[PDB]
Amino acid sequence: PLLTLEEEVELARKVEEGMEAIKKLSEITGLDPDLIREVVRAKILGSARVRHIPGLKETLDPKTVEEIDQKLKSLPKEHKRYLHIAREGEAARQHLIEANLRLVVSIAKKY
Amino acid sequence: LPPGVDALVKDGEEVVKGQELAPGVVSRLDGVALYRFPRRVRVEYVKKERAGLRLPLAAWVEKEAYKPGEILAELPEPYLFRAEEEGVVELKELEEGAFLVLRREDEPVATYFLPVGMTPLVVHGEIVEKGQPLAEAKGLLRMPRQVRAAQVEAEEEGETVYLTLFLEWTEPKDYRVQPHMNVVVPEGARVEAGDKIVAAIDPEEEVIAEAEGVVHLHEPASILVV
DNA sequence: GCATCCGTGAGTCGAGGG
DNA sequence: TATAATGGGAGCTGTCACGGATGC
RNA sequence: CCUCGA
C-alpha cells in the first residue's frame, strides 16, 4: 500500500539514522563501513541472498558475516545501540522502495 | 483513525479478533496493538506540596491521611473559610477542587486547599485582608479524585481545627504532534526536567519535559495490530 | 469413458519486385 | 540532485487433423 | 511477402 506523509517521513528518518549508525559503527569497530553495511543488510534480508559484492576486499559468505555479526554483538550496550539502529534502517529502506514502486511505473510508461 | 477521535485500547495491549479499537474500527485478528504516530502527547506532571485548611471541630473526621474521594469533614450548616493572611490571591483550579495561594509582594504568604464542596468566593488576583471569607463549605466536603493527601498534621485552636495537609497529585499538559516530528519516549515512561519527549526537524519545535511527570500517548494516526 | 484446448503440419523449381 | 507527481494499453480472425492434457 | 511461370 501507499505511504502516508507520516509513514514516509518515518521510514526516511530511519534510513538516515541507520546510515549514520553505520558510520558510527565504522568509527568504533575500525571495520570497513561498506563491510558493516553489507553484514547488516545480509542479516536483514536473509541467508537466501549473500553474494560477493564487487567493492568489498573480502568475499562475503555466511562464515565472514557470522564472524562480523558476532564482533558487532560483542560491544557495550551504548555501542550495541547503533547495530539496532542500522538494522532498522535497512528494513525501513526496503519498505520505502517497495512502497514507492508504483511511481516508477507511472513515469516509465511515458518512455 | 479519523481525525480527532481517540483510541479505545491502549498501546502495547493484547486484542481479540472482532474487538473494537475505536468507534469505527474493528480488529480482524488477534495480537498486540501498537500506536502509529500519536498526534497528542499528554504529560501528567507530578506535584508534591503542602497546604492548609481550617474547619469547625464538630465537622471534622480525624484521619492520618485522606484517600481520593474520602470524606474530609461533614458540615451541619454553611461554614465560611476565612483568610488568615493578607495579600493577593492566586487561584489555581484543578479538575475538581482548588488551591488558593496568597502572595504579598513576591513571596507567597499562604497556601490553602479548597476540597470538593467548598466554593471559592474570590477571583484570581484579588486583594484580601485577614478574616475575609475565601470560600464557603456546604454539607459534605471530600477530597477530589485527582489529588490525594499523603500526611495530615492537625492543630486544635478554639472551637476549630487547622489541618496542614501534605498533598500529592498530577496536572495535565497536552502537546500537539506535527507529522514531521516523532515521539522518542514510550507509554508510561517517567521523565525529568530537560528530558526529550518528541524530537523534530529544528530544535525550537522540539518537545522537552518541563518538570517530573509521566507520559501518555493519545489520538494515534493509525493502529497496527500484529 | 468423452468433450475440449494446444500445438503442429499443409508440393517443387524457377523469375522478378523488392 | 529537492514543488508534487504512485497499477499499461492494444486489441480483425472465413482450416483442419493429428496426440494429449484437462474435465464431468 | 507479393505477383508471375512450370
GROMACS .gro file of C-alpha atoms (C1' of nucleotides) in nm:
model
  385
    1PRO     CA    1   0.000   0.000   0.000
    2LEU     CA    2   0.088   0.365  -0.048
    3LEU     CA    3   0.277   0.563   0.215
    4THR     CA    4   0.115   0.840   0.417
    5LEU     CA    5   0.320   1.152   0.497
    6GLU     CA    6   0.398   1.023   0.845
    7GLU     CA    7   0.495   0.669   0.737
    8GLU     CA    8   0.713   0.808   0.457
    9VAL     CA    9   0.891   1.058   0.683
   10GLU     CA   10   0.943   0.789   0.947
   11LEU     CA   11   1.100   0.542   0.705
   12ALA     CA   12   1.325   0.809   0.552
   13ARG     CA   13   1.434   0.916   0.901
   14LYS     CA   14   1.514   0.556   0.994
   15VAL     CA   15   1.724   0.524   0.677
   16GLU     CA   16   1.917   0.843   0.753
   17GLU     CA   17   1.982   0.748   1.116
   18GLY     CA   18   2.079   0.394   1.016
   19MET     CA   19   2.339   0.519   0.771
   20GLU     CA   20   2.469   0.747   1.048
   21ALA     CA   21   2.474   0.444   1.279
   22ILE     CA   22   2.680   0.253   1.024
   23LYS     CA   23   2.929   0.540   1.014
   24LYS     CA   24   2.945   0.530   1.395
   25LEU     CA   25   2.997   0.151   1.388
   26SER     CA   26   3.286   0.212   1.149
   27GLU     CA   27   3.428   0.469   1.393
   28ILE     CA   28   3.407   0.231   1.691
   29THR     CA   29   3.494  -0.102   1.526
   30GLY     CA   30   3.769   0.022   1.297
   31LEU     CA   31   3.599  -0.201   1.041
   32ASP     CA   32   3.512  -0.100   0.685
   33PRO     CA   33   3.180   0.091   0.660
   34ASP     CA   34   3.085  -0.099   0.345
   35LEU     CA   35   3.152  -0.439   0.505
   36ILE     CA   36   2.943  -0.334   0.807
   37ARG     CA   37   2.661  -0.219   0.577
   38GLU     CA   38   2.673  -0.547   0.383
   39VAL     CA   39   2.660  -0.756   0.702
   40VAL     CA   40   2.364  -0.560   0.843
   41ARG     CA   41   2.191  -0.586   0.504
   42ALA     CA   42   2.270  -0.959   0.479
   43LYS     CA   43   2.118  -1.038   0.817
   44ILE     CA   44   1.813  -0.820   0.742
   45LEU     CA   45   1.729  -0.987   0.410
   46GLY     CA   46   1.828  -1.344   0.495
   47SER     CA   47   2.070  -1.621   0.414
   48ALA     CA   48   1.876  -1.650   0.086
   49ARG     CA   49   2.091  -1.368  -0.055
   50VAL     CA   50   2.454  -1.333   0.044
   51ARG     CA   51   2.686  -1.287  -0.257
   52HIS     CA   52   3.025  -1.132  -0.335
   53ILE     CA   53   2.998  -0.752  -0.351
   54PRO     CA   54   3.238  -0.605  -0.612
   55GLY     CA   55   3.391  -0.333  -0.391
   56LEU     CA   56   3.450  -0.549  -0.083
   57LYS     CA   57   3.806  -0.668  -0.023
   58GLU     CA   58   3.670  -0.981   0.149
   59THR     CA   59   3.446  -1.247  -0.002
   60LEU     CA   60   3.102  -1.221   0.160
   61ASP     CA   61   2.989  -1.567   0.273
   62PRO     CA   62   2.792  -1.684   0.580
   63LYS     CA   63   3.117  -1.753   0.772
   64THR     CA   64   3.254  -1.399   0.745
   65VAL     CA   65   2.915  -1.239   0.807
   66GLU     CA   66   2.877  -1.459   1.116
   67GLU     CA   67   3.221  -1.357   1.244
   68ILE     CA   68   3.146  -0.989   1.177
   69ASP     CA   69   2.797  -1.006   1.330
   70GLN     CA   70   2.949  -1.166   1.640
   71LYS     CA   71   3.210  -0.890   1.655
   72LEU     CA   72   2.917  -0.647   1.629
   73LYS     CA   73   2.724  -0.826   1.906
   74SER     CA   74   3.023  -0.822   2.144
   75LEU     CA   75   3.022  -0.445   2.208
   76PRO     CA   76   2.887  -0.246   2.506
   77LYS     CA   77   2.518  -0.161   2.528
   78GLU     CA   78   2.567   0.200   2.417
   79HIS     CA   79   2.795   0.068   2.140
   80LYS     CA   80   2.540  -0.206   2.059
   81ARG     CA   81   2.269   0.059   2.014
   82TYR     CA   82   2.396   0.152   1.666
   83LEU     CA   83   2.363  -0.208   1.544
   84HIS     CA   84   1.988  -0.197   1.613
   85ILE     CA   85   1.969   0.147   1.451
   86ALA     CA   86   2.136   0.010   1.135
   87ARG     CA   87   1.912  -0.298   1.121
   88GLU     CA   88   1.603  -0.078   1.148
   89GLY     CA   89   1.749   0.148   0.879
   90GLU     CA   90   1.789  -0.140   0.636
   91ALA     CA   91   1.433  -0.263   0.692
   92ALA     CA   92   1.297   0.090   0.650
   93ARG     CA   93   1.492   0.129   0.325
   94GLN     CA   94   1.342  -0.193   0.188
   95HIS     CA   95   0.987  -0.095   0.278
   96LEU     CA   96   1.038   0.257   0.137
   97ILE     CA   97   1.145   0.128  -0.206
   98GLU     CA   98   0.863  -0.127  -0.213
   99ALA     CA   99   0.609   0.140  -0.117
  100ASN     CA  100   0.727   0.375  -0.392
  101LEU     CA  101   0.748   0.117  -0.675
  102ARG     CA  102   0.423   0.248  -0.838
  103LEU     CA  103   0.579   0.588  -0.915
  104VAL     CA  104   0.844   0.421  -1.132
  105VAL     CA  105   0.570   0.259  -1.343
  106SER     CA  106   0.383   0.588  -1.377
  107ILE     CA  107   0.700   0.757  -1.504
  108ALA     CA  108   0.832   0.475  -1.724
  109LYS     CA  109   0.500   0.435  -1.910
  110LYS     CA  110   0.592   0.765  -2.080
  111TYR     CA  111   0.922   0.640  -2.228
  112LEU     CA  112  -0.812   0.656   1.285
  113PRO     CA  113  -1.023   0.953   1.170
  114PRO     CA  114  -0.907   1.296   1.290
  115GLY     CA  115  -0.996   1.394   1.645
  116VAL     CA  116  -1.138   1.059   1.761
  117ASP     CA  117  -0.921   0.868   2.008
  118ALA     CA  118  -0.831   0.505   2.071
  119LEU     CA  119  -1.049   0.267   2.272
  120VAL     CA  120  -0.749   0.045   2.363
  121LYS     CA  121  -0.400   0.118   2.494
  122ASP     CA  122  -0.061   0.088   2.328
  123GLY     CA  123   0.100  -0.249   2.398
  124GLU     CA  124  -0.222  -0.433   2.487
  125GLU     CA  125  -0.340  -0.772   2.364
  126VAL     CA  126  -0.656  -0.762   2.150
  127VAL     CA  127  -0.901  -1.027   2.024
  128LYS     CA  128  -1.050  -1.065   1.676
  129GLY     CA  129  -1.362  -0.853   1.648
  130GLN     CA  130  -1.268  -0.630   1.942
  131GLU     CA  131  -1.319  -0.265   1.851
  132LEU     CA  132  -1.008  -0.048   1.858
  133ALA     CA  133  -1.225   0.262   1.803
  134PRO     CA  134  -1.591   0.355   1.739
  135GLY     CA  135  -1.546   0.283   1.366
  136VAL     CA  136  -1.259   0.029   1.377
  137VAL     CA  137  -1.296  -0.345   1.440
  138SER     CA  138  -0.984  -0.562   1.458
  139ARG     CA  139  -0.995  -0.863   1.225
  140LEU     CA  140  -0.716  -1.057   1.403
  141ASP     CA  141  -0.571  -1.121   1.750
  142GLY     CA  142  -0.248  -0.988   1.897
  143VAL     CA  143  -0.058  -0.686   2.024
  144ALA     CA  144  -0.181  -0.344   1.910
  145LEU     CA  145   0.072  -0.066   1.851
  146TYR     CA  146   0.031   0.309   1.806
  147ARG     CA  147   0.114   0.477   1.474
  148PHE     CA  148   0.200   0.846   1.521
  149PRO     CA  149   0.009   0.978   1.824
  150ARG     CA  150  -0.096   1.334   1.744
  151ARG     CA  151  -0.137   1.434   2.112
  152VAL     CA  152   0.106   1.356   2.395
  153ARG     CA  153  -0.041   1.420   2.742
  154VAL     CA  154   0.220   1.458   3.018
  155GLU     CA  155   0.092   1.421   3.375
  156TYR     CA  156   0.337   1.623   3.584
  157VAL     CA  157   0.351   1.507   3.946
  158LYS     CA  158   0.345   1.771   4.223
  159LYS     CA  159   0.413   1.731   4.597
  160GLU     CA  160   0.316   2.038   4.803
  161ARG     CA  161   0.191   2.144   5.146
  162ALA     CA  162  -0.137   2.331   5.208
  163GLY     CA  163  -0.369   2.427   5.495
  164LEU     CA  164  -0.737   2.446   5.585
  165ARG     CA  165  -0.944   2.546   5.890
  166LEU     CA  166  -1.267   2.368   5.986
  167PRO     CA  167  -1.512   2.350   6.277
  168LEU     CA  168  -1.407   2.074   6.514
  169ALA     CA  169  -1.757   1.920   6.513
  170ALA     CA  170  -1.750   1.868   6.135
  171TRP     CA  171  -1.404   1.712   6.106
  172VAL     CA  172  -1.327   1.342   6.057
  173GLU     CA  173  -0.999   1.264   6.231
  174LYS     CA  174  -0.771   1.068   5.997
  175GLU     CA  175  -0.395   1.039   5.949
  176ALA     CA  176  -0.429   1.063   5.569
  177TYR     CA  177  -0.704   1.109   5.310
  178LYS     CA  178  -0.751   0.885   5.007
  179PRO     CA  179  -0.909   1.045   4.697
  180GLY     CA  180  -1.284   1.087   4.729
  181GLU     CA  181  -1.270   1.015   5.104
  182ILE     CA  182  -1.478   1.245   5.326
  183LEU     CA  183  -1.267   1.515   5.493
  184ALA     CA  184  -1.547   1.658   5.711
  185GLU     CA  185  -1.926   1.696   5.725
  186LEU     CA  186  -2.082   2.034   5.791
  187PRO     CA  187  -2.425   2.077   5.951
  188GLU     CA  188  -2.460   2.442   5.844
  189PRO     CA  189  -2.279   2.659   5.587
  190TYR     CA  190  -1.926   2.743   5.703
  191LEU     CA  191  -1.709   3.034   5.591
  192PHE     CA  192  -1.342   2.956   5.547
  193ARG     CA  193  -1.164   3.284   5.618
  194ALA     CA  194  -0.825   3.421   5.519
  195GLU     CA  195  -0.561   3.405   5.791
  196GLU     CA  196  -0.318   3.624   5.594
  197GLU     CA  197  -0.329   3.937   5.380
  198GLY     CA  198  -0.212   3.950   5.020
  199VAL     CA  199  -0.304   3.890   4.657
  200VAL     CA  200  -0.494   3.575   4.558
  201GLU     CA  201  -0.357   3.323   4.307
  202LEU     CA  202  -0.648   3.089   4.231
  203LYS     CA  203  -0.536   2.754   4.087
  204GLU     CA  204  -0.828   2.532   3.983
  205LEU     CA  205  -0.793   2.157   3.940
  206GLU     CA  206  -1.044   1.923   3.772
  207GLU     CA  207  -1.242   1.941   4.095
  208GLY     CA  208  -1.141   2.149   4.394
  209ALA     CA  209  -0.887   2.426   4.416
  210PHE     CA  210  -0.569   2.573   4.557
  211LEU     CA  211  -0.571   2.932   4.681
  212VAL     CA  212  -0.230   3.095   4.733
  213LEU     CA  213  -0.188   3.434   4.895
  214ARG     CA  214   0.111   3.636   4.797
  215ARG     CA  215   0.244   3.958   4.939
  216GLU     CA  216   0.498   4.114   4.712
  217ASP     CA  217   0.678   3.816   4.561
  218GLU     CA  218   0.691   3.551   4.831
  219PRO     CA  219   0.371   3.351   4.889
  220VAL     CA  220   0.245   3.405   5.243
  221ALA     CA  221  -0.032   3.141   5.246
  222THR     CA  222  -0.133   2.820   5.068
  223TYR     CA  223  -0.491   2.697   5.121
  224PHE     CA  224  -0.664   2.389   4.981
  225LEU     CA  225  -1.034   2.400   4.896
  226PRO     CA  226  -1.166   2.043   4.865
  227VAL     CA  227  -1.486   1.944   4.686
  228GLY     CA  228  -1.789   2.103   4.848
  229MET     CA  229  -1.607   2.434   4.903
  230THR     CA  230  -1.696   2.718   4.665
  231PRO     CA  231  -1.425   2.987   4.634
  232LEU     CA  232  -1.564   3.339   4.680
  233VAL     CA  233  -1.255   3.513   4.538
  234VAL     CA  234  -1.120   3.579   4.190
  235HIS     CA  235  -0.765   3.541   4.063
  236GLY     CA  236  -0.556   3.845   4.157
  237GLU     CA  237  -0.799   3.961   4.427
  238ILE     CA  238  -0.668   4.159   4.725
  239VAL     CA  239  -0.774   4.007   5.058
  240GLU     CA  240  -0.726   4.106   5.422
  241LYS     CA  241  -0.731   3.884   5.729
  242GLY     CA  242  -1.065   3.734   5.825
  243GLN     CA  243  -1.210   3.790   5.478
  244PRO     CA  244  -1.402   3.480   5.359
  245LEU     CA  245  -1.217   3.297   5.081
  246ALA     CA  246  -1.464   3.010   5.035
  247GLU     CA  247  -1.793   2.859   5.150
  248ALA     CA  248  -1.811   2.498   5.268
  249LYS     CA  249  -2.154   2.336   5.246
  250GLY     CA  250  -2.263   1.990   5.356
  251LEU     CA  251  -2.010   1.713   5.294
  252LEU     CA  252  -1.662   1.807   5.172
  253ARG     CA  253  -1.439   1.538   5.023
  254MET     CA  254  -1.102   1.502   4.858
  255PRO     CA  255  -1.100   1.540   4.478
  256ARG     CA  256  -1.032   1.235   4.263
  257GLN     CA  257  -0.707   1.359   4.104
  258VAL     CA  258  -0.539   1.461   4.435
  259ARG     CA  259  -0.461   1.256   4.747
  260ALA     CA  260  -0.348   1.360   5.097
  261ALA     CA  261  -0.021   1.189   5.190
  262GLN     CA  262   0.010   1.305   5.552
  263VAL     CA  263  -0.214   1.507   5.784
  264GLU     CA  264  -0.094   1.730   6.066
  265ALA     CA  265  -0.357   1.898   6.283
  266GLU     CA  266  -0.373   2.171   6.546
  267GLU     CA  267  -0.668   2.241   6.775
  268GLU     CA  268  -0.744   2.611   6.824
  269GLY     CA  269  -1.059   2.730   6.996
  270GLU     CA  270  -1.364   2.560   6.850
  271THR     CA  271  -1.186   2.487   6.521
  272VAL     CA  272  -0.909   2.261   6.397
  273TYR     CA  273  -0.647   2.364   6.142
  274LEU     CA  274  -0.510   2.098   5.905
  275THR     CA  275  -0.169   2.106   5.739
  276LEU     CA  276  -0.202   1.858   5.451
  277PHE     CA  277   0.090   1.714   5.256
  278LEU     CA  278  -0.075   1.679   4.916
  279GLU     CA  279   0.045   1.484   4.611
  280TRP     CA  280  -0.128   1.500   4.273
  281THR     CA  281  -0.071   1.537   3.898
  282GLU     CA  282  -0.159   1.806   3.646
  283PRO     CA  283  -0.206   1.753   3.271
  284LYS     CA  284  -0.031   1.928   2.984
  285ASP     CA  285  -0.107   1.843   2.620
  286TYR     CA  286   0.133   1.868   2.325
  287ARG     CA  287   0.013   1.860   1.963
  288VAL     CA  288   0.235   1.639   1.747
  289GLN     CA  289   0.305   1.755   1.391
  290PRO     CA  290   0.367   1.485   1.127
  291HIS     CA  291   0.735   1.568   1.074
  292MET     CA  292   0.806   1.514   1.446
  293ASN     CA  293   0.845   1.180   1.624
  294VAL     CA  294   0.787   1.059   1.980
  295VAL     CA  295   1.112   0.926   2.130
  296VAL     CA  296   0.954   0.828   2.465
  297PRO     CA  297   0.735   0.520   2.538
  298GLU     CA  298   0.397   0.494   2.709
  299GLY     CA  299   0.405   0.548   3.085
  300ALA     CA  300   0.771   0.649   3.096
  301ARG     CA  301   0.899   0.877   3.371
  302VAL     CA  302   1.069   1.197   3.256
  303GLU     CA  303   1.258   1.471   3.440
  304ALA     CA  304   1.349   1.832   3.365
  305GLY     CA  305   1.534   1.855   3.034
  306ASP     CA  306   1.437   1.512   2.901
  307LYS     CA  307   1.322   1.499   2.538
  308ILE     CA  308   0.974   1.365   2.463
  309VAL     CA  309   0.918   1.445   2.094
  310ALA     CA  310   1.200   1.534   1.854
  311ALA     CA  311   1.160   1.748   1.543
  312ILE     CA  312   1.339   1.889   1.238
  313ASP     CA  313   1.464   2.204   1.414
  314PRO     CA  314   1.543   2.243   1.786
  315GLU     CA  315   1.291   2.521   1.855
  316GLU     CA  316   0.997   2.292   1.774
  317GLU     CA  317   1.110   2.003   1.995
  318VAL     CA  318   0.903   1.897   2.296
  319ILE     CA  319   1.108   1.897   2.618
  320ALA     CA  320   0.971   1.785   2.955
  321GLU     CA  321   0.945   2.087   3.187
  322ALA     CA  322   0.933   1.901   3.519
  323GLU     CA  323   0.895   1.547   3.653
  324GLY     CA  324   0.599   1.361   3.504
  325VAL     CA  325   0.462   1.056   3.325
  326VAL     CA  326   0.379   1.026   2.955
  327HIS     CA  327   0.054   0.918   2.787
  328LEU     CA  328   0.002   0.881   2.413
  329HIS     CA  329  -0.336   0.963   2.258
  330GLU     CA  330  -0.501   1.009   1.918
  331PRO     CA  331  -0.271   0.785   1.712
  332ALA     CA  332  -0.278   0.838   1.337
  333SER     CA  333  -0.345   0.466   1.297
  334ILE     CA  334  -0.323   0.140   1.494
  335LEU     CA  335  -0.108  -0.158   1.390
  336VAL     CA  336  -0.237  -0.495   1.513
  337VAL     CA  337   0.037  -0.759   1.499
  338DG     C1'  338  -1.525  -4.338  -2.052
  339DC     C1'  339  -1.577  -3.849  -2.368
  340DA     C1'  340  -1.583  -3.337  -2.476
  341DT     C1'  341  -1.205  -2.971  -2.525
  342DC     C1'  342  -0.784  -2.655  -2.584
  343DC     C1'  343  -0.290  -2.650  -2.776
  344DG     C1'  344   0.043  -2.733  -3.092
  345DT     C1'  345   0.191  -2.854  -3.549
  346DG     C1'  346   0.187  -2.964  -4.005
  347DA     C1'  347  -0.028  -2.844  -4.507
  348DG     C1'  348   0.435  -2.950  -5.348
  349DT     C1'  349   0.885  -2.818  -5.616
  350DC     C1'  350   1.168  -2.542  -5.900
  351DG     C1'  351   1.221  -2.106  -6.109
  352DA     C1'  352   1.172  -1.545  -6.205
  353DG     C1'  353   1.102  -1.068  -6.051
  354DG     C1'  354   0.997  -0.699  -5.736
  355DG     C1'  355   1.176  -0.552  -5.368
  356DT     C1'  356   2.028   1.625  -0.750
  357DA     C1'  357   1.463   1.856  -0.379
  358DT     C1'  358   0.702   2.179  -0.558
  359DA     C1'  359   0.434   1.711  -0.642
  360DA     C1'  360   0.398   1.362  -0.926
  361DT     C1'  361   0.237   0.650  -0.707
  362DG     C1'  362  -0.122  -0.013  -1.133
  363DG     C1'  363  -0.025  -0.045  -1.927
  364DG     C1'  364  -0.252  -0.045  -2.335
  365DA     C1'  365  -0.387  -0.261  -2.763
  366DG     C1'  366  -0.699  -0.514  -2.906
  367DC     C1'  367  -0.999  -0.840  -3.746
  368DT     C1'  368  -0.982  -1.351  -3.734
  369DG     C1'  369  -1.358  -1.734  -4.318
  370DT     C1'  370  -0.879  -2.452  -4.177
  371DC     C1'  371  -0.820  -2.897  -4.026
  372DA     C1'  372  -0.629  -3.336  -3.844
  373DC     C1'  373  -0.341  -3.516  -3.555
  374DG     C1'  374  -0.174  -3.655  -2.990
  375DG     C1'  375  -0.261  -3.521  -2.518
  376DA     C1'  376  -0.367  -3.292  -2.126
  377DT     C1'  377  -0.781  -3.122  -1.879
  378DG     C1'  378  -1.251  -3.202  -1.703
  379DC     C1'  379  -1.752  -3.426  -1.588
  380C      C1'  380   0.562  -1.113  -4.857
  381C      C1'  381   0.372  -1.049  -5.320
  382U      C1'  382   0.292  -1.141  -5.818
  383C      C1'  383   0.428  -1.449  -6.220
  384G      C1'  384   0.597  -1.923  -6.481
  385A      C1'  385   0.640  -2.474  -6.499
   0.00000   0.00000   0.00000
